[PDB]
């Protein structure tokens, strides 16, 4: 299931840490 209304090239990353677990959350601008 992929988003269809986003501009993929706008991808921006945030490393988010809670406790000792870090994930990368990538977000997009609507197209």
């Amino acid at each position: 299931p992929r988003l269809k209304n986003v501009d993929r090239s706008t991808a921006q990353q945030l490393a988010v840490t809670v406790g000792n677990v870090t994930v990368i959350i990538t977000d997009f601008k609507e197209k």
Partner: protein, 111 residues
């Protein structure tokens, strides 16, 4: 370069006038928890505030955390269930979403 995709929408009734109410479009690993998503909402807002007019800024990027947002998912009962911060997105997808589409979550500032 990532896994579950989802759309974050402002809660339909809890939002107030001066609240940041952006719809956000994201992807991340299934092992991210609800607390990571909450913290993400706070950090992204904090970043946007850096260039904002600043009348009701609420975030300091340095201290933004999972405590600043409550996350909900809609149910077949029409209920908006609050998701526990410890839940992984894979768990939420399995147990609450059950649809072959990007997950739809709602948020509201705490509270």
């Amino acid at each position: 370069a990532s896994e579950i995709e989802l759309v974050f929408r402002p809660h339909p009734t809890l939002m107030e006038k001066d609240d940041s109410a952006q719809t956000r479009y994201i992807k991340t690993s299934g092992n991210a928890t609800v607390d990571h998503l909450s913290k993400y909402l706070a950090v992204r807002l904090a970043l946007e505030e850096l260039r904002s007019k600043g009348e009701s800024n609420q975030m300091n990027l340095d201290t933004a955390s999972e405590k600043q947002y409550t996350i909900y998912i809609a149910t077949a009962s029409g209920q908006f269930t609050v998701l526990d911060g410890s839940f992984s997105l894979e768990l939420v997808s399995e147990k609450y979403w059950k649809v072959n589409k990007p997950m739809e979550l709602y948020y509201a500032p705490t509270k």
